[PDB]
Amino acid sequence: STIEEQAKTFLDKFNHEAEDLFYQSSLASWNYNTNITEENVQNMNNAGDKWSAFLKEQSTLAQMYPLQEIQNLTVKLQLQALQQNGSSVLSEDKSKRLNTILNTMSTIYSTGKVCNPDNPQECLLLEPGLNEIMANSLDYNERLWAWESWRSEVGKQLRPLYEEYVVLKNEMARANHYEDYGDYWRGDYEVNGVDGYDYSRGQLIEDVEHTFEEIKPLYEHLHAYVRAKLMNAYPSYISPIGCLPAHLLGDMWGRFWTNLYSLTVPFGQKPNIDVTDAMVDQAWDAQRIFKEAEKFFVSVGLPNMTQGFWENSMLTDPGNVQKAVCHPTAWDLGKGDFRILMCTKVTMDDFLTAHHEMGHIQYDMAYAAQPFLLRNGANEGFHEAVGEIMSLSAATPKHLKSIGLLSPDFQEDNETEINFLLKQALTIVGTLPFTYMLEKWRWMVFKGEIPKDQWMKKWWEMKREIVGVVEPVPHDETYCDPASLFHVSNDYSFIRYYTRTLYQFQFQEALCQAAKHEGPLHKCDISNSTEAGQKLFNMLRLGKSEPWTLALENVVGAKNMNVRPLLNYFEPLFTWLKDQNKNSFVGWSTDWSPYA
Amino acid sequence: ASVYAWNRKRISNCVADYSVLYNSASFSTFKCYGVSPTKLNDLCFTNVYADSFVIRGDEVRQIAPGQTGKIADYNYKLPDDFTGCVIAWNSNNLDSKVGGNYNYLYRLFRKSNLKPFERDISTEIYQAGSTPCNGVEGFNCYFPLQSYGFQPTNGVGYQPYRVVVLSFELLHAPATVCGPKKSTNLVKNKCVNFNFNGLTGTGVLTESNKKFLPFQQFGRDIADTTDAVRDPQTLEILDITPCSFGGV
Ligand SMILES: *[C@@H]1O[C@H](CO)[C@@H](O[C@@H]2O[C@H](CO)[C@@H](O)[C@H](O)[C@H]2NC(C)=O)[C@H](O)[C@H]1NC(C)=O
Ligand SMILES: *[C@@H]1O[C@H](CO)[C@@H](O)[C@H](O)[C@H]1NC(C)=O
Ligand SMILES: *[C@@H]1O[C@H](CO)[C@@H](O)[C@H](O)[C@H]1NC(C)=O
Ligand SMILES: *[C@@H]1O[C@H](CO)[C@@H](O)[C@H](O)[C@H]1NC(C)=O
Ligand SMILES: *[C@@H]1O[C@H](CO)[C@@H](O)[C@H](O)[C@H]1NC(C)=O
Ligand SMILES: *[C@@H]1O[C@H](CO)[C@@H](O)[C@H](O)[C@H]1NC(C)=O
């Protein structure tokens, strides 16, 4: 005769009904990503539509559940997630603007165009067309055209579409009793109902900004250092007194600076840590690449992979007619079914991606005992940062010499670590200001205190201040270059990548202290330590059933999002960068110098 | 049948060969509770009722005496001190289909715990709240019946394992059927211990000229001294005498 026993009956009914429907949709989506036919797109959408419509019926039934008397916390978190109305609050004339706009945005992003205006020779897709002009060439004139080949040919048609998108997605928050749509994405980090453990939605803006005043002095010296080794390819085209152009930062958007490693190597005379040539001497294949990753995990203490994955998943590119994309993604089909979807290669990245993409799988069966609504990560940053802590460990020279990939006689001097640490700094430190700035811009435009004519003059003036990028060409408000990125166009919360770095290094210091490694964090290893495996597995198995702030106290002992155990990873790099920047102009103000 | 419709059929008047199970090389949960696999062959108990049902891989551990849970509490409860064995094996090749095997159902909610060795067949709906349900699903009806989903691609954890339960209890009924005690190597003209069904002794085994009727097991001549046995595996009558002895 209590609502508490009535909710446990309903959640027990929903868990068995949803996991049957979710497995059919996940199995249909797996076949779409392996064997593309004309009917397979309709076949996946048929099962995926009835799964989305199933949640519409269950959300209305759980609404009549009053929350003010449920003392149990396991079902309180389940009822809060199940009762999210989402698109049910909108009218029929307004709900049709979601699926129409989002599929037009995705189709627009799928159009690859590098054909020159008034010179129509040929142009390929994004991966074969756009990536070669950004990762290999060192010419300023065509890269400026290539910067304008996508930000003036794809983003020009999004202004009437994306501004209409940010005025109706913003209205759901008042209908869902949220502040704005930027506040809606912070509900994943929101914790309520526990005394002293509560995480407010508005304190997260402050905590991200509070951790940024020590990221900045690392990024101040990184940007100062990288501007002296960039003017070698462009002598008279950039001044070493201001900021950097946007089309010279590794990517089209400057998210990852991995392609600047070849241009800005400190001391390239001694050979780098490269074992791509080592695997082709020993005849490595797709099976042996993932087999050494599996024995790496069981040496830590995690359970090994099941027998229904090696003979069931695909590893290479199969056949000739199957033109399916094999971007490295982790699949959680449920009911004990776990798959990895990627194309294997004997390279540095694919060997690390083999370790990286398995970690999301190793996180997925950990909360397999949890109910279906709690069968997820603690937040959006846990499931990405867990899959990357083994990528830091697998790239260490100690782990590479353990298997036998590296040479048995490889000395470890100063520069053998600065070359490795600076490669990690361009892909980790360089993406923190880009991730924070874009989410700060998206949060305020979702708040609504940014007029229509002030998108670019505020977006560009903060890119110049925080990130430190001079615009290669001035742009008015009709340009829409911030919407060109993959995550912003497909409705992905990008704040999960800023907290990914701050999580993947909080766990690294906790696991290295558990393994009792004598040395710095760059040479540390996780394998051959069952004490570190048991420390990680206790927090992986919790899932969303416990608050994420309780997951931190199980590994690091700090209930807040700690940023201190990330500067300690780059202290060998940071102390050298402070000595290298004795005469360079470190620290930029606002700089309209090059393109006034 | 389903877990909530487990059958109960008596096994009697026949020999149950438990040796073939040991060398099957396909079992995964061949465990015995309250008895040993080796010592249930020489001696046996009546009431060999066998229960047939399908239990998922994750819920195999729930099916054990002295252990509670969901299946053991609302579907089929094993009584404490259950002197029997549990035998299970995988049935993925046959007890599975694409799209979900919607042929096995189970009870998810019950007002009271199931009495051990009770089979319940009813359409009564659960009463989570106070307001009665009049057959129309509402906020407190919660139709407990649900269909399991088994697929060939399902993980080993939830793989549908074919499991059978054998019970062995010694009630007031004697003269029951036991397991296999195949044979030893018979020896003739040598002082050898013999223990047939109901009698034992020592002596010399040799051929006999006398004839026994087809409804006896042994015989005696004088002063209740056994001197001839007719073993049933050979259908032959033999003569038994104590082996040579005397005072030197
Ligand atoms: C982790 O443990 C494994 C298992 O002992 C180590 O593998 C051994 O490596 C040494 C030399 O590298 C060999 O002589 C042994 O034969 C290996 N053992 C086996 C079972 O193959 C591995 O080196 C350890 N790695 C670290 C970093 O400690
Ligand atoms: C794979 O796709 C091709 C055409 O794209 C189709 O003919 C074939 O039947 C498919 N095979 C499987 C196993 O899906
Ligand atoms: C909530 O209910 C579950 C049901 O098993 C129980 O395990 C858990 O301890 C309960 N939590 C609280 C705080 O009562
Ligand atoms: C979802 O929509 C229904 C229909 O109006 C409404 O009663 C309910 O309060 C909404 N849920 C939330 C959380 O606002
Ligand atoms: C996983 O480890 C267990 C324990 O040693 C072993 O029995 C099993 O065969 C292993 N499975 C695989 C696929 O390696
Ligand atoms: C690193 O640099 C310092 C400063 O010159 C030097 O003393 C030290 O020997 C170097 N380390 C190695 C391993 O050469």
d(CA A584, CA A241): 9
Please state, in angstroms and as integers, the Cα–Cα distance from residue A69 to each residue in A73, A75, A192, A240, B57, following that order. 11, 12, 14, 64, 36
d(CA B165, CA A505): 52
Q: Of A372, A367, A365, A376, which Cα lies nearest the Cα of A58?
A: A372
- A590 shares contact with chain B (CB less than 8 Å): no
Tokens of A132: 């070669």
Q: Which residue of A has its CA nearest to B153?
A: A337
Type of residue at B72 = A
d(CA B139, CA B141): 6
Which helix (H) or strand (E) segment holds residue B184: the answer is none
Question: Residue A344, exposed/middle/buried by CB under 10 A (0-12, 13-18, 19+)?
Answer: buried
Q: Are A240 and A585 in contact (CB under 8 A)?
A: yes
Which helix (H) or strand (E) segment holds residue B201: the answer is strand B200-207
When divided into structural domains, chain A yields a total of: 1
Beta-strand pair B31-33/B84-90: antiparallel
State how far Cα A384 lies from the chain centre. Answer: 6
Helix (H, G, I), strand (E, B) or coil at A111: coil
Helix (H, G, I), strand (E, B) or coil at A329: strand
Helix (H, G, I), strand (E, B) or coil at A127: helix
Residue B191 sits at φ, ψ, to 5 deg, of: -65, 110
List chain A residues with CB under 8 Å of B139: 6, 61, 64
d(CA A250, CA A391): 21
State how far Cα A511 lies from the chain centre. Answer: 22
DSSP class of residue A130?
I
Distance from CA of A63 to the nearest CA of B (A): 11
- Domain span at residue A493 reads 1-596
* Ligand 5 pocket residue status of A307, Cβ below 6 Å: yes
- Alpha carbon dihedral A160, A161, A167, A172, in 10-degree steps, equals 170
- B232 shares contact with chain A (CB less than 8 Å): no
List chain A residues with CB under 8 Å of B151: 23, 27, 335
Which residue reads 């994405």 in tokens? A185
Q: Counting ligands in written order, which one lies closest to the CA of residue A63?
A: 4
Q: Are B215 and B208 in contact (CB under 8 A)?
A: no
Question: Residues A56, A61, A66, CA angle at the centre, nearest 5°?
Answer: 130
Q: Of B81, B80, B47, B76, which Cα lies nearest the Cα of B63?
A: B76
Header resolution in angstroms: 3.9
Active centre residues of A (catalytic)? 357, 487
Q: Are A273 and A422 in contact (CB under 8 A)?
A: no
Residue A413 CB contacts under 8 Å (≥ 6 apart), including other chains: none
DSSP class of residue A340?
E
Residues A336, B158: C-beta atoms closer than 8 Å: yes
Protein residue closest via CA to atom 14 of ligand 6: A413
Which of B142, B143, B147, B150 to mutate against chain A (most A CBs within 10 Å)? B142
Concatenated DSSP letters of B47-96: ---EEEEEEESTTTTTSSTT--SSHHHHT-PPPTT--EEEEEEE-TTTS-
Q: Of B137, B165, B213, which Cα lies nearest the Cα of B52?
A: B165
Tokens of B103: 């042929």
Q: Are A346 and A287 in contact (CB under 8 A)?
A: no
Which residue reads 């954890």 in tokens? B157
d(CA A167, CA A94): 12
d(CA A397, CA A409): 11
3-class secondary structure per residue, A154-220? CHHHCHHHHHHHHHHCCCHHHHCCCCCHHHHHCCCCCECCCCCCCECCCHHHHHHHHHHHHHHHHHH
Helix (H, G, I), strand (E, B) or coil at A16: helix
List chain A residues with CB under 8 Å of B149: 19-20, 23, 335
Residues 93-112 of B with CB under 8 A from A: 99-100, 108-109
- Alpha carbon dihedral A231, A234, A240, A246, in 10-degree steps, equals -100
Type of residue at B223 = A
Beta bridge partners of B9: B50
Q: Are B79 and B33 in contact (CB under 8 A)?
A: no
d(CA A11, CA A72): 13
Helix (H, G, I), strand (E, B) or coil at A539: helix
d(CA B42, CA B179): 7
Tokens of A359: 């970690």
d(CA B154, CA B227): 65
Question: Residues A404, A408, A409, CA angle at the centre, nearest 5°?
Answer: 155
- Alpha carbon dihedral B68, B70, B74, B80, in 10-degree steps, equals -20
d(CA A167, CA A446): 8
Tokens of A574: 């940071």
Which residue reads 């906020």 in tokens? B139
Tokens of A177: 């009793």
Which of A3, A4, A9, A332 to mutate against chain B (most B CBs within 10 Å)? A9
Distance from CA of B131 to the nearest CA of A (A): 8
Q: Of B112, A64, B102, which Cα lies nearest the Cα of B124?
A: B112
d(CA A328, CA A345): 12
A84: left (phi over 0), alpha (psi -120 to 50) or beta: beta
Protein residue closest via CA to atom 5 of ligand 5: A304
Which residue among A10, A61, A335 sits closest to B154, beta carbon to beta carbon?
A335
State how far Cα B118 lies from the chain centre. Answer: 18
> Which of A35, A42, A325, when mutated, tests ligand 2's pocket best, judged by the most ligand atoms within 8 Å of its CB?
A35
Closest-lying ligand 4 atom to the alpha carbon of residue A85: 1
List chain A residues with CB under 8 Å of B108: 12-13, 16
Residue A411 CB contacts under 8 Å (≥ 6 apart), including other chains: none
Which helix (H) or strand (E) segment holds residue A52: the answer is helix A38-61
Residue A429 CB contacts under 8 Å (≥ 6 apart), including other chains: A215, A218, A219, A222, A570
